[PDB]
Design a protein around this ligand. Sequence first.
Ligand code: PLP
Ligand code: PLP
Lengths: 444, 442
Amino acid sequence: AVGAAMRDHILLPAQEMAKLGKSAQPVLTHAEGIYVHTEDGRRLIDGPAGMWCAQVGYGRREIVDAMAHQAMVLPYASPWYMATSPAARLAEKIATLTPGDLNRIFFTTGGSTAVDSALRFSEFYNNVLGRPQKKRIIVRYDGYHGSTALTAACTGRTGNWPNFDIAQDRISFLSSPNPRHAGNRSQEAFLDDLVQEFEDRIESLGPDTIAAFLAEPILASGGVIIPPAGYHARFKAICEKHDILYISDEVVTGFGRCGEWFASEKVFGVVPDIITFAKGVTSGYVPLGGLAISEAVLARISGENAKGSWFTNGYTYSNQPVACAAALANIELMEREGIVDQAREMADYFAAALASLRDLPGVAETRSVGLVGCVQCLLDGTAEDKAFTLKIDERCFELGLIVRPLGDLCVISPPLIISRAQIDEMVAIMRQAITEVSAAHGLT
Amino acid sequence: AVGAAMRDHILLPAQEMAKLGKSAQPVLTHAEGIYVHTEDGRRLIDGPAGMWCAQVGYGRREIVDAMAHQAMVLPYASPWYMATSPAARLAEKIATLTPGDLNRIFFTTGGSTAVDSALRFSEFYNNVLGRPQKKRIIVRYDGYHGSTALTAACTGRTGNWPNFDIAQDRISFLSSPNPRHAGNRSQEAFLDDLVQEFEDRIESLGPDTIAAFLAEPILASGGVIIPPAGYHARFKAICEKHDILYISDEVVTGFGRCGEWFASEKVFGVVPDIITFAKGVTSGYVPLGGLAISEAVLARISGENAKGSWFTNGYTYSNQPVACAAALANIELMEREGIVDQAREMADYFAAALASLRDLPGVAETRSVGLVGCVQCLLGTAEDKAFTLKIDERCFELGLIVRPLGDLCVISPPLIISRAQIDEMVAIMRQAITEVSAAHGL
Ligand SMILES: Cc1ncc(COP(=O)(O)O)c(C=O)c1O
Ligand SMILES: Cc1ncc(COP(=O)(O)O)c(C=O)c1O
């Protein structure tokens, strides 16, 4: 009956239009800890933490109570005219966690709107500065920045492109900083070529035309792609030379995922100009997004430098008290129980548990940073491998584990509170699923 | 200290950059019924119902208990892979309330992303049909459709435009359908000119280049601008002639605001191809938006006609169980207490109460539809814009929030507002207009 309602009345994200009104999705009913349950009652490990969001897991009354209390007391105030305590205190809190002087926050309802607003900010910025040509955005193939028209245009995941008008002169794609595209080169020489590609792009487009460089610290939806060490710092140095805003998209990496509140500086060696965030900010309990903007950047277009300008960008649910109260409870809980510390302390055990799968003939590679990980499966990335990995994903589900299928990769990013025992349980399910499917494909 | 934290750590929507770090907003602390209260302890009527969203007003535990329950049980499920009861039941519920066959729903987190997705669909739709040139969007001056880069560019409120790269070749602006722009013409003849301008625009651009016509039924943020009667049906007929998708933006008008679940057909006489909604679907308790798409539209690009296409648009919080449970509880509460019927029955009284202000020398005009209305104040000019801001400020001091909008004071109260509370609201307005007028010498 729930399935019949989904089928007849919902348009799904990434819906195969040939199977519109015939599609089946598993029905989830309830959840606790790292676990979710089907309408059959069967318990499964939420390997992706929903969608890299459920940092503290499911069933935390602390977030729910703070949500409910604020919803009753004062659920809405217009952010154009009226201030609230939740928004004020949340912005104050996040300002203590960000690198450098990124101490002023603009709030949105999710990651796309935050990145959209970061990009609209880069426009505004250069317009106020009297640089109307300085508008272009530099991104990478395999990157993901959202699903608004502009943010999808900034998205390097080309599987999302068909039947959308993605290409435009404002946006230029650099190569994916994938270590396994290094070929006959060392990782250090591959990084040399990556960096040179960027400065060549700057030269051919003209620095005076480029507003922003937009980059996830690791390319999560691309398949947990970790740039060769030093990438972020080398690119930042180049941005600063040409006065190009570095927007680090920490929608996935932020709020504990890479063992830190923000991965940009502490893990990846970059102090960005802007950080975007979502997901983990509320542990996926309610929609919130936003962007932290550098004080020195804002000073150049405000005060005596304002030129009578007004930042006429904003959403109805920007600074919404309910979502901000929930996030505040989330962060306070994560602080209280050292959950960010927990993720940092579990990272090596996580990496090593995944690495024990490299034993298998079906496994090409495993990688990870913090508690985001990846198992690459090849028949030995062709079309045969994608279907093979899909069958592994399916077998994992049957044995009690949700993995996220990304082409030839099984992706896991579990709640940050996952134990050593639960990690091994997860891995043992993956091992069984890989072994059995590989046998049906003649791997020996 | 709350105001110190806003000052130093928050960038506001429409922030005056000359006053960044010095802007002070009144702090709201708590709310109940139609009222909200400031930090200083003053009680205020929420005249705009927040931002045309608080349909049932504040403190309804029905919505909050349903939020809390879902948040504990299953707060998140990935919309790409996993289904949920609240999302499914809510989509089913909305489908019973929309005009025509607008029976399939795509959820987003708000109004902008609903409209952004509607427009991305129009693009997807024509690409799947083998019509890659059929992409242009027709909108109107004074219209408002959002704050994403695409939806802002579709926004005809030119006050939002400076220092943003709004202009683009895909989007063309018609004249605002504003009755006070008729001049020497009758309202009917003015309507004839609006319709003719649209037809001429289609011919000038070429019909085969136009994907969508995007329009609020009434132009809310644009200044409670109600098109001459017949506008919507006549534009729709023209849309259908050229296979242009009529996208009716009911982000403000939807869920009771015009005395109806959806204003499009039952008030303004158009069955659209797509309806976008948000705000009042949850009574403002939690972010939710979405769009309702016509079954016939979708059939042309799905099933046998799919051409191996995949609608690869979607947000992480699409179909979010908590927002959908809140919305479902909101709608069910509105059904039980007949709140849509209440708003329909209160509209004439609301209209007449505002019209009692026309008495005043300072008041030029009042207009309304359903439970959205406005009062025009003149001494027009920027002097009148500063005059109206003063009236707004005096209203606040006397216990009423109004939305300032040029020379208009705009109200859109919770739909459960009583005759008594309407009178209270108007008495505050009357006092504030008489006081500011006398101080300006009138
Ligand atoms: C890195 C990154 N940025 C932006 C987004 C878009 O966020 P949302 O889907 O909440 O709009 C995503 C998607 O989760 C993302 O992974
Ligand atoms: C008619 C209309 N459409 C779209 C929007 C944008 O909605 P949101 O601010 O939730 O993104 C607005 C503002 O609420 C609106 O008034």
